[PDB]
GROMACS .gro file of C-alpha atoms in nm:
model
  330
    1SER     CA    1   1.182   1.813  -3.093
    2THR     CA    2   1.105   1.789  -2.721
    3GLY     CA    3   0.840   1.641  -2.496
    4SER     CA    4   0.726   1.720  -2.142
    5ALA     CA    5   0.480   1.511  -1.938
    6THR     CA    6   0.364   1.523  -1.580
    7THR     CA    7   0.415   1.208  -1.370
    8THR     CA    8   0.180   1.148  -1.075
    9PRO     CA    9   0.216   0.917  -0.774
   10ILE     CA   10  -0.028   0.627  -0.783
   11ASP     CA   11  -0.098   0.643  -0.406
   12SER     CA   12  -0.020   0.829  -0.086
   13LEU     CA   13   0.313   0.645  -0.039
   14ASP     CA   14   0.466   0.724  -0.383
   15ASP     CA   15   0.475   0.353  -0.455
   16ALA     CA   16   0.508   0.429  -0.827
   17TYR     CA   17   0.440   0.712  -1.069
   18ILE     CA   18   0.220   0.712  -1.378
   19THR     CA   19   0.257   0.926  -1.689
   20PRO     CA   20  -0.008   0.956  -1.960
   21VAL     CA   21   0.099   0.818  -2.300
   22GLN     CA   22  -0.094   0.848  -2.629
   23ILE     CA   23  -0.093   0.529  -2.839
   24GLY     CA   24  -0.253   0.485  -3.179
   25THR     CA   25  -0.482   0.682  -3.407
   26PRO     CA   26  -0.712   0.817  -3.281
   27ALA     CA   27  -0.513   0.842  -2.958
   28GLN     CA   28  -0.573   0.592  -2.681
   29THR     CA   29  -0.432   0.741  -2.359
   30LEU     CA   30  -0.286   0.490  -2.112
   31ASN     CA   31  -0.113   0.570  -1.784
   32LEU     CA   32   0.226   0.400  -1.790
   33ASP     CA   33   0.498   0.347  -1.532
   34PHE     CA   34   0.818   0.495  -1.680
   35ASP     CA   35   1.094   0.253  -1.579
   36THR     CA   36   1.462   0.341  -1.626
   37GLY     CA   37   1.540  -0.016  -1.511
   38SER     CA   38   1.379  -0.200  -1.805
   39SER     CA   39   1.347  -0.168  -2.180
   40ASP     CA   40   1.000  -0.289  -2.285
   41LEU     CA   41   0.698  -0.069  -2.357
   42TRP     CA   42   0.412  -0.303  -2.276
   43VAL     CA   43   0.044  -0.241  -2.215
   44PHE     CA   44  -0.273  -0.399  -2.094
   45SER     CA   45  -0.467  -0.466  -2.409
   46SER     CA   46  -0.775  -0.617  -2.576
   47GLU     CA   47  -0.562  -0.937  -2.587
   48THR     CA   48  -0.500  -0.954  -2.210
   49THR     CA   49  -0.665  -1.258  -2.042
   50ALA     CA   50  -0.996  -1.110  -1.919
   51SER     CA   51  -0.956  -1.251  -1.560
   52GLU     CA   52  -0.620  -1.065  -1.536
   53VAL     CA   53  -0.769  -0.719  -1.609
   54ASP     CA   54  -0.923  -0.535  -1.309
   55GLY     CA   55  -0.979  -0.165  -1.379
   56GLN     CA   56  -0.685  -0.089  -1.612
   57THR     CA   57  -0.735   0.103  -1.934
   58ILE     CA   58  -0.652  -0.122  -2.230
   59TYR     CA   59  -0.496  -0.060  -2.568
   60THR     CA   60  -0.712  -0.201  -2.854
   61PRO     CA   61  -0.495  -0.222  -3.166
   62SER     CA   62  -0.795  -0.304  -3.388
   63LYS     CA   63  -0.927   0.051  -3.315
   64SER     CA   64  -0.600   0.218  -3.423
   65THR     CA   65  -0.563   0.298  -3.792
   66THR     CA   66  -0.182   0.309  -3.749
   67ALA     CA   67  -0.140  -0.021  -3.560
   68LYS     CA   68   0.034  -0.308  -3.742
   69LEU     CA   69   0.105  -0.655  -3.604
   70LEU     CA   70   0.480  -0.715  -3.581
   71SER     CA   71   0.440  -1.061  -3.725
   72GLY     CA   72   0.600  -1.342  -3.529
   73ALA     CA   73   0.731  -1.121  -3.251
   74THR     CA   74   0.673  -1.218  -2.887
   75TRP     CA   75   0.794  -1.086  -2.556
   76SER     CA   76   0.821  -1.207  -2.198
   77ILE     CA   77   0.965  -1.022  -1.902
   78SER     CA   78   1.033  -1.090  -1.535
   79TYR     CA   79   1.105  -0.802  -1.295
   80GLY     CA   80   1.317  -0.784  -0.977
   81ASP     CA   81   1.000  -0.801  -0.759
   82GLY     CA   82   0.893  -1.141  -0.909
   83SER     CA   83   0.623  -0.988  -1.135
   84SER     CA   84   0.597  -1.078  -1.503
   85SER     CA   85   0.408  -1.028  -1.826
   86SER     CA   86   0.419  -1.158  -2.183
   87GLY     CA   87   0.247  -1.131  -2.517
   88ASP     CA   88   0.276  -1.025  -2.879
   89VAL     CA   89   0.378  -0.699  -3.048
   90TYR     CA   90   0.231  -0.422  -3.261
   91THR     CA   91   0.397  -0.118  -3.402
   92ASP     CA   92   0.205   0.207  -3.362
   93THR     CA   93   0.244   0.581  -3.310
   94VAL     CA   94   0.331   0.671  -2.948
   95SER     CA   95   0.340   1.023  -2.806
   96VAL     CA   96   0.467   1.141  -2.468
   97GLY     CA   97   0.416   1.499  -2.367
   98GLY     CA   98   0.390   1.616  -2.727
   99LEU     CA   99   0.690   1.409  -2.857
  100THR     CA  100   0.581   1.155  -3.119
  101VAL     CA  101   0.751   0.836  -3.237
  102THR     CA  102   0.615   0.646  -3.532
  103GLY     CA  103   0.670   0.273  -3.562
  104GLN     CA  104   0.725   0.221  -3.186
  105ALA     CA  105   0.701  -0.139  -3.068
  106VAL     CA  106   0.399  -0.159  -2.838
  107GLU     CA  107   0.411  -0.494  -2.658
  108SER     CA  108   0.052  -0.614  -2.601
  109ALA     CA  109   0.010  -0.828  -2.290
  110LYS     CA  110  -0.166  -1.161  -2.324
  111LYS     CA  111  -0.074  -1.251  -1.962
  112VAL     CA  112   0.023  -1.044  -1.660
  113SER     CA  113   0.108  -1.160  -1.305
  114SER     CA  114  -0.113  -1.094  -1.007
  115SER     CA  115   0.073  -0.780  -0.888
  116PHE     CA  116  -0.012  -0.608  -1.222
  117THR     CA  117  -0.378  -0.717  -1.216
  118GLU     CA  118  -0.413  -0.595  -0.856
  119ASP     CA  119  -0.280  -0.246  -0.944
  120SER     CA  120  -0.568  -0.081  -1.134
  121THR     CA  121  -0.373   0.249  -1.166
  122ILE     CA  122  -0.091   0.115  -1.391
  123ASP     CA  123  -0.186   0.038  -1.753
  124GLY     CA  124   0.164  -0.081  -1.848
  125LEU     CA  125   0.531   0.009  -1.845
  126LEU     CA  126   0.747   0.230  -2.063
  127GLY     CA  127   1.107   0.115  -2.037
  128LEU     CA  128   1.390   0.369  -2.049
  129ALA     CA  129   1.695   0.148  -1.987
  130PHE     CA  130   1.919   0.051  -2.281
  131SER     CA  131   1.758  -0.131  -2.573
  132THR     CA  132   1.997  -0.429  -2.522
  133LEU     CA  133   1.755  -0.539  -2.243
  134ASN     CA  134   1.444  -0.538  -2.463
  135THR     CA  135   1.283  -0.883  -2.455
  136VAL     CA  136   1.116  -0.895  -2.800
  137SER     CA  137   1.208  -1.210  -2.996
  138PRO     CA  138   1.324  -1.286  -3.258
  139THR     CA  139   1.394  -0.920  -3.347
  140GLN     CA  140   1.486  -0.705  -3.044
  141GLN     CA  141   1.311  -0.367  -3.039
  142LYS     CA  142   1.415  -0.016  -2.940
  143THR     CA  143   1.286   0.188  -2.649
  144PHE     CA  144   1.077   0.500  -2.700
  145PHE     CA  145   1.386   0.708  -2.605
  146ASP     CA  146   1.614   0.529  -2.848
  147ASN     CA  147   1.359   0.577  -3.129
  148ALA     CA  148   1.311   0.946  -3.038
  149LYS     CA  149   1.679   1.027  -2.984
  150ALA     CA  150   1.783   1.139  -3.331
  151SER     CA  151   1.482   1.382  -3.347
  152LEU     CA  152   1.542   1.537  -3.003
  153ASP     CA  153   1.705   1.876  -2.960
  154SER     CA  154   1.954   1.706  -2.717
  155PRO     CA  155   1.980   1.325  -2.667
  156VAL     CA  156   1.861   1.335  -2.306
  157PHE     CA  157   1.565   1.280  -2.082
  158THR     CA  158   1.519   1.402  -1.726
  159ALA     CA  159   1.333   1.266  -1.427
  160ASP     CA  160   1.199   1.509  -1.170
  161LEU     CA  161   0.990   1.296  -0.935
  162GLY     CA  162   0.785   1.457  -0.660
  163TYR     CA  163   0.758   1.368  -0.292
  164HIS     CA  164   0.388   1.310  -0.236
  165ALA     CA  165   0.332   1.534  -0.541
  166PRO     CA  166   0.341   1.526  -0.921
  167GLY     CA  167   0.668   1.571  -1.109
  168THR     CA  168   0.790   1.578  -1.465
  169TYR     CA  169   0.960   1.368  -1.734
  170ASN     CA  170   1.118   1.583  -2.005
  171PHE     CA  171   1.266   1.458  -2.332
  172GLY     CA  172   1.521   1.648  -2.540
  173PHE     CA  173   1.601   1.940  -2.310
  174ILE     CA  174   1.721   2.023  -1.959
  175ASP     CA  175   1.484   2.265  -1.774
  176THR     CA  176   1.732   2.495  -1.598
  177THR     CA  177   1.445   2.628  -1.379
  178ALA     CA  178   1.376   2.282  -1.231
  179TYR     CA  179   1.686   2.250  -1.007
  180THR     CA  180   1.911   2.452  -0.779
  181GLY     CA  181   2.288   2.487  -0.808
  182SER     CA  182   2.468   2.290  -1.076
  183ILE     CA  183   2.425   1.942  -1.226
  184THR     CA  184   2.704   1.695  -1.141
  185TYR     CA  185   2.758   1.437  -1.413
  186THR     CA  186   2.899   1.090  -1.346
  187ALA     CA  187   3.003   0.801  -1.566
  188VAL     CA  188   2.766   0.526  -1.673
  189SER     CA  189   2.840   0.163  -1.757
  190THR     CA  190   2.596   0.011  -2.006
  191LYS     CA  191   2.745  -0.338  -1.968
  192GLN     CA  192   2.436  -0.476  -1.789
  193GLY     CA  193   2.191  -0.261  -1.992
  194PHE     CA  194   2.115  -0.029  -1.701
  195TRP     CA  195   2.194   0.331  -1.610
  196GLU     CA  196   2.470   0.195  -1.383
  197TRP     CA  197   2.693   0.440  -1.199
  198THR     CA  198   2.912   0.463  -0.886
  199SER     CA  199   2.817   0.679  -0.592
  200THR     CA  200   3.108   0.824  -0.395
  201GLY     CA  201   2.969   0.750  -0.048
  202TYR     CA  202   2.707   0.831   0.208
  203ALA     CA  203   2.621   0.999   0.533
  204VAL     CA  204   2.347   0.926   0.789
  205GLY     CA  205   2.176   1.231   0.930
  206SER     CA  206   2.422   1.494   1.045
  207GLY     CA  207   2.703   1.230   1.059
  208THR     CA  208   3.032   1.242   0.879
  209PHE     CA  209   3.040   1.146   0.514
  210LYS     CA  210   3.190   0.802   0.446
  211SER     CA  211   3.386   0.796   0.119
  212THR     CA  212   3.322   0.458  -0.041
  213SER     CA  213   3.233   0.345  -0.395
  214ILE     CA  214   2.877   0.211  -0.431
  215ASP     CA  215   2.794   0.081  -0.776
  216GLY     CA  216   2.422   0.081  -0.850
  217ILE     CA  217   2.152   0.163  -1.101
  218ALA     CA  218   1.924   0.464  -1.137
  219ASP     CA  219   1.581   0.293  -1.153
  220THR     CA  220   1.260   0.496  -1.162
  221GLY     CA  221   1.059   0.174  -1.164
  222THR     CA  222   1.181   0.065  -0.818
  223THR     CA  223   1.014   0.231  -0.520
  224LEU     CA  224   1.287   0.204  -0.255
  225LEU     CA  225   1.663   0.260  -0.211
  226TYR     CA  226   1.850  -0.075  -0.196
  227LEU     CA  227   2.209  -0.050  -0.069
  228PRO     CA  228   2.471  -0.279   0.080
  229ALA     CA  229   2.389  -0.432   0.418
  230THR     CA  230   2.670  -0.240   0.591
  231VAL     CA  231   2.528   0.097   0.475
  232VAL     CA  232   2.170   0.005   0.556
  233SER     CA  233   2.263  -0.122   0.906
  234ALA     CA  234   2.448   0.203   0.972
  235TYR     CA  235   2.134   0.402   0.878
  236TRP     CA  236   1.882   0.204   1.082
  237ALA     CA  237   2.115   0.190   1.386
  238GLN     CA  238   2.031   0.565   1.422
  239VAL     CA  239   1.656   0.490   1.466
  240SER     CA  240   1.551   0.368   1.815
  241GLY     CA  241   1.365   0.041   1.786
  242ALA     CA  242   1.440  -0.021   1.415
  243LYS     CA  243   1.512  -0.381   1.321
  244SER     CA  244   1.528  -0.612   1.025
  245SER     CA  245   1.219  -0.836   1.023
  246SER     CA  246   1.243  -1.161   0.820
  247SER     CA  247   0.862  -1.197   0.866
  248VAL     CA  248   0.789  -0.854   0.710
  249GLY     CA  249   1.075  -0.870   0.455
  250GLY     CA  250   1.305  -0.586   0.559
  251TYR     CA  251   1.376  -0.310   0.805
  252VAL     CA  252   1.084  -0.178   1.008
  253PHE     CA  253   1.079   0.103   1.260
  254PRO     CA  254   0.840   0.247   1.517
  255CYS     CA  255   0.584   0.470   1.359
  256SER     CA  256   0.656   0.714   1.646
  257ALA     CA  257   1.013   0.771   1.518
  258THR     CA  258   1.154   1.075   1.345
  259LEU     CA  259   1.386   0.942   1.070
  260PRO     CA  260   1.726   1.090   0.993
  261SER     CA  261   1.815   1.205   0.644
  262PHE     CA  262   2.040   1.000   0.416
  263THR     CA  263   2.303   1.162   0.193
  264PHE     CA  264   2.458   0.999  -0.114
  265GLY     CA  265   2.758   1.122  -0.309
  266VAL     CA  266   2.767   1.205  -0.680
  267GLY     CA  267   3.130   1.285  -0.748
  268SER     CA  268   3.213   1.568  -0.507
  269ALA     CA  269   2.844   1.666  -0.484
  270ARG     CA  270   2.590   1.543  -0.229
  271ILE     CA  271   2.216   1.464  -0.259
  272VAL     CA  272   2.024   1.470   0.067
  273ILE     CA  273   1.720   1.245   0.107
  274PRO     CA  274   1.503   1.394   0.387
  275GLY     CA  275   1.403   1.150   0.660
  276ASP     CA  276   1.036   1.174   0.572
  277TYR     CA  277   1.110   1.033   0.225
  278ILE     CA  278   1.224   0.710   0.398
  279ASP     CA  279   0.888   0.651   0.575
  280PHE     CA  280   0.664   0.402   0.390
  281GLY     CA  281   0.403   0.390   0.665
  282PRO     CA  282   0.241   0.106   0.858
  283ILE     CA  283   0.327  -0.247   0.750
  284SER     CA  284  -0.045  -0.332   0.766
  285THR     CA  285  -0.335  -0.107   0.820
  286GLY     CA  286  -0.338   0.032   1.177
  287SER     CA  287   0.004  -0.114   1.275
  288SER     CA  288   0.252   0.089   1.476
  289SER     CA  289   0.538  -0.077   1.286
  290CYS     CA  290   0.636   0.119   0.976
  291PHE     CA  291   0.826   0.000   0.668
  292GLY     CA  292   1.158   0.157   0.585
  293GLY     CA  293   1.248   0.316   0.254
  294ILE     CA  294   1.614   0.212   0.270
  295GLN     CA  295   1.658  -0.166   0.246
  296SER     CA  296   1.944  -0.409   0.192
  297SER     CA  297   2.037  -0.511  -0.161
  298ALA     CA  298   2.218  -0.822  -0.036
  299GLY     CA  299   1.947  -1.067  -0.175
  300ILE     CA  300   1.925  -0.878  -0.521
  301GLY     CA  301   2.278  -0.882  -0.669
  302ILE     CA  302   2.272  -0.503  -0.748
  303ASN     CA  303   2.229  -0.179  -0.558
  304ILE     CA  304   1.927   0.022  -0.673
  305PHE     CA  305   1.882   0.396  -0.650
  306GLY     CA  306   1.504   0.379  -0.677
  307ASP     CA  307   1.244   0.650  -0.632
  308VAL     CA  308   1.334   0.723  -0.266
  309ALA     CA  309   1.671   0.849  -0.388
  310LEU     CA  310   1.577   0.984  -0.730
  311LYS     CA  311   1.287   1.198  -0.602
  312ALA     CA  312   1.541   1.396  -0.392
  313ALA     CA  313   1.714   1.509  -0.714
  314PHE     CA  314   1.673   1.642  -1.064
  315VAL     CA  315   1.820   1.355  -1.268
  316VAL     CA  316   1.957   1.378  -1.622
  317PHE     CA  317   1.975   1.060  -1.828
  318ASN     CA  318   2.227   1.163  -2.096
  319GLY     CA  319   2.199   0.928  -2.395
  320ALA     CA  320   2.486   1.074  -2.595
  321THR     CA  321   2.734   0.835  -2.762
  322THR     CA  322   2.905   0.809  -2.421
  323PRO     CA  323   2.609   0.803  -2.176
  324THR     CA  324   2.630   0.981  -1.843
  325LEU     CA  325   2.398   1.055  -1.548
  326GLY     CA  326   2.358   1.396  -1.393
  327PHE     CA  327   2.222   1.487  -1.051
  328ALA     CA  328   2.123   1.823  -0.911
  329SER     CA  329   1.953   1.925  -0.589
  330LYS     CA  330   1.612   2.089  -0.621
   0.00000   0.00000   0.00000
């Protein structure tokens, strides 16, 4: 089997991407944030505290003939941005882009934090990291990918995120029309439950490439590119008037600037992030200070290749017995 679904930016900045997902029988379609940095499939639901729902589409298990309570199971998750959610668990039929899994754990939110409530466009998350990070207790559950894997034509999924445009998540096949050149594969460590890999270095603009190992995660659920402070300082030093602002919470730059590109290494290959991908616009409406898309990881504890980086590539998440990542230009 295979599946193929379009993913759409939620706003004009590409702050996140949503993908329609069918849950239950008859289908209830929710727009979920596919997150390669977490491992829970959770949704706004008929159980979510009413004051915490503001425009989201909800899953109502009582209207699904295939829903079953997963008795005694609870979940609770905290993300890198300080957001959180928790609740109970149903199993139900879940389809993505024509690929169906029966008996998928669908984590029904009873509580969500303010950042989720305030985002009416995101009806929940679909985690695509390793199932070792799944938060369901007392019986940990599998991701949609792990449940689909054995049925897929190839044990892979691909992320093809657009810049200010829709893109695609494919499951079970690699669309050889979707990228240019060849795919460079690199090793993955699953020790922390993430798609963790080591970049071979970076360049700023037309500058020379610096060979240096940068361990980090491929995380579709993170908007920005978070790298070591040395790398990030080297990038922003090439932008007149850029500075790190403790008041704003990262590097800002004059909205009048033209940003340089940023290159990262994948083995001997190179992925180029155009400068415009690094512009996240005014810090507040009407400001002439703009927020940068490359930020320091120093206060996180991990480097994160978020959407700023991933949208510059065609990315293969190879879930074979020995997992690997692949990157191609596009």
